[PDB]
Write a protein that binds this ligand. Structure first.
Ligand code: HEM
Ligand code: HEM
Ligand code: H4B
Ligand code: H4B
Ligand code: 5NI
Ligand code: 5NI
Lengths: 413, 413
């Protein structure tokens, strides 16, 4: 009938009934095929599209206090008719809005989901060129940033039609720092963007060889070739790292962008696929303080902050790492707060997520959750999420990963 | 053919071929049925036992630089013969030793597995009464403790025969503190052992109503009723909590036992089942410092250590929790080191585990690993394990969970 879910912290039990609406032991795999919706060079077969489309129209019209049956039946008919005559179909703006929030709502890996209903939708389905994409993206960045008072938003570009005319942002995130393979063996900047940085150069981009060089938007429109565009510096808002007690922190010359905007995911809804639909929320402290600054495959500033703290950076047992990373986290939080830039610490985030789950189970009996992703990279068992058993499952609408565009792209020049 | 496993930190790739030898989306479930080997009231059907038995005899004799074929064939024959005439079969001491290390080696949830080959085996298969079990357990505790220089060991009691004559320790761990439902609503001691503490009282145990009262061994022998036994205090070694800078720490009057000995798991090997086989290794700092002392469902001393540190325990964003728990961890490590009691910090543990995995893949191409359990309850991404993708799968031999004995036990009085 259902599935019991226990919360070892409060002892509370829950019954998951929502997992029955899923699709189809790979433990900690980052990019599992089950979470990816790749390319296709032929339209969505009508026998597949029509059913998925109806289900979505039923979901949409099925959600409202005062349900209007007429409009529902009518939409069902007009949609089927549209599919018959055109092949694919066009969602109403209202439906799209609903789609994007639901897809987010159904994001197993997102901790910010309590905010799900609070999203801004930019309808760029009329878009047709790279330069027009670049303008919509700029519009996005400017609206989302709001001078530090960050706002969650998403820009939806034209849906995949036949598959050969795909709209795709080649970037992983909208704002992202560059990383270069320095002469003296060392890596400079964000070592994670090394491979993509090279690509930008190959497409003719002037590399400013620095630690915090904002990378260029690499836009692909209507299947065409990717065109490079430098993001207007005035648009990219950054925070300078500063510790509230360690005056030597600023001397580290650190900073990070305030806009966490996922750029390369595909939105699937009612059988339709939107290969380009960048979105953003606001940062959660640990993202910058722990992953960005502390991963060895990133800025790796941990040993650096260690010695300047006086810690025994040569004795693991001294727990100097637990000491440094915490102070780094404090810097991030302090710096965003001082410069009036939205941000939420992980504890607070975890609590709101728990409240979210409770709301989700009451409202629909379930909440697709990925424990491996929801538990913060620090203070694991200190956050309530660690103690909550949770079910992971792909629903619909949903945000899928895509095959890195530079692999499956037939060049023209 | 195989399965690619990537380590996002070093970028290294690995090929898992060992997962093919497994048995048979439930994400973060603590006690999944797949990890439990419950009761049975009939012997292991010969058609099932014979094949499993052979596989094990092939595994055993298949592991050695200089393989002796004769002994192998002979053992195969004698084993089958024994199964024909008696039903079940008896493992040689050498085989049992090999079984216990392999079962440990195959423990997805254990981080200490680099130590796998370094285990002491106490053969108590001749045991027949509760009082004899109690003596073997005492012998175990005394050998494992070694006056602080902890030694990994396991005591194997008689295998399950028909299922109605099960040897079972009713305790979760050998040494474990009691927890009572105090008059004034509050809970005293280890809130996790509340239900079991009540049981001990019901079986006639004198409750000393304290924060650190070592619970009694509740032993069940040859299917008989569970008899209670108080662990000789001289045997139970404890460490007094003491911070190296905060002289007010000792004032908290904290302490914890030095012996982490899992008592209620079942050992499965070559079709045979050993329902009682307590084992132990040595503590990993975070276990006591984070889970035992900091979980809200345990001693919950976090807010307590917070205020005495001066921290803003009323503002989550101040990261006071990240500050306290770290100092608590420091206390634990410092206290065990000072009192000459073995212990390993989590960073060091993680590193050794990584070395283990590398050894496992080279030696047998795989290492069953549970990421959710291997990643420390603090400093997640700071440890290398967080970045390692890993496959979870039940092999054989293996240590299974059992249904809590007090549920499926037909009382006699
Ligand atoms: C308003 C604040 C929000 C917060 C605090 C939040 C936080 C997070 C965090 C911390 C992660 C993990 C990121 C990583 O480790 O790479 C994440 C992932 C994700 N979030 Fe949210 N989020 C927010 C808004 C949004 C919105 C508006 C959407 C979509 C419309 C969304 C969709 C997702 C998706 C799909 C992922 C997965 C990305 C991946 O798998 O790499 N988030 N979020
Ligand atoms: C020598 C030092 C050892 C260390 C540092 C170590 C550490 C750990 C840790 C930290 C856990 C997680 C405990 C929890 O959160 O409940 C664990 C679990 C486990 N360990 Fe080890 N271990 C050691 C030796 C052993 C030995 C000797 C065996 C078996 C012969 C073993 C078998 C297991 C099993 C089966 C579990 C799972 C228990 C459960 O699922 O609740 N460990 N170990
Ligand atoms: C709900 C969640 O699975 C549970 O609280 C966990 C997770 N990981 C764990 N990790 C370890 N080592 N030990 C545990 O008790 C748990 N419990
Ligand atoms: C190997 C492991 O799955 C990987 O490093 C993880 C795990 N959990 C994560 N959690 C979040 N939120 N983000 C991540 O990048 C990862 N990566
Ligand atoms: O996906 N997102 O928009 C998103 C939102 C908030 C975030 N904090 N840290 C990473 C991150 C990503
Ligand atoms: O299972 N064990 O023997 C075992 C060994 C070491 C440990 N550290 N923390 C818990 C724990 C359990």
């Amino acid at each position: 009938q259902y599935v019991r879910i226990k919360n070892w912290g409060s002892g509370e039990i829950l019954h998951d009934t929502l997992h029955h609406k899923a699709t189809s032991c790979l433990g900690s795999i980052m990019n599992p095929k089950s979470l990816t919706r790749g390319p296709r060079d032929k339209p969505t077969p009508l026998e597949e599209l029509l059913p998925h489309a109806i289900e979505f129209i039923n979901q949409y019209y099925g959600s409202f206090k005062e349900a209007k049956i007429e409009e529902h039946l009518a939409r069902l008919e007009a949609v089927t008719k549209e599919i018959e005559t055109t092949g694919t179909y066009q969602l109403t703006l209202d439906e799209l809005i609903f789609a994007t929030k639901m897809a987010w709502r159904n994001a197993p890996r997102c901790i910010g989901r309590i905010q799900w209903s609070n999203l801004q939708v930019f309808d760029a389905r009329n878009c047709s060129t790279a330069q027009e994409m670049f303008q919509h993206i700029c519009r996005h960045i400017l609206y989302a940033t709001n001078n530090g008072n960050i706002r969650s938003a998403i820009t939806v570009f034209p849906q995949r039609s036949d598959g050969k005319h795909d709209f795709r942002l080649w970037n992983s995130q909208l704002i992202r720092y560059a990383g270069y393979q320095m002469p003296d063996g060392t890596i400079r900047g964000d070592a994670a963007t090394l491979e993509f940085t090279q690509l930008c150069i190959d497409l003719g981009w002037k590399p400013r060889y620095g630690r915090f060089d904002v990378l260029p938007l690499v836009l692909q429109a209507d299947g065409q070739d990717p065109e490079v565009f430098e993001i207007p510096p005035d648009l990219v808002l950054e925070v300078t790292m500063e510790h509230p007690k360690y005056e030597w922190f600023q001397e580290l010359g650190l900073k990070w962008y305030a806009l966490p905007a996922v750029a390369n995911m595909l939105l699937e809804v009612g059988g339709l696929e939107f290969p380009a639909c960048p979105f953003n929320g606001w940062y959660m402290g640990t993202e910058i303080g722990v992953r960005d600054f502390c991963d060895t495959q990133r800025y790796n500033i941990l040993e650096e902050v260690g010695r300047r703290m006086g810690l025994e950076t040569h004795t693991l047992a001294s727990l100097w790492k637990d000491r440094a990373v915490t102070e780094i986290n404090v810097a991030v939080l302090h710096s965003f707060q001082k410069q009036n830039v939205t941000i939420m610490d992980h504890h607070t985030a975890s609590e709101s997520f728990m409240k979210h789950m409770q709301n989700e189970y009451r409202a629909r009996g379930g909440c697709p959750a990925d424990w491996i992703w929801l538990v913060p990279p620090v203070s694991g068992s200190i956050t309530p999420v660690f103690h909550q058993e949770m079910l992971n499952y792909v629903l619909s609408p949903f945000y899928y990963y895509q095959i890195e565009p530079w692999k499956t792209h037939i060049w023209q020049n």
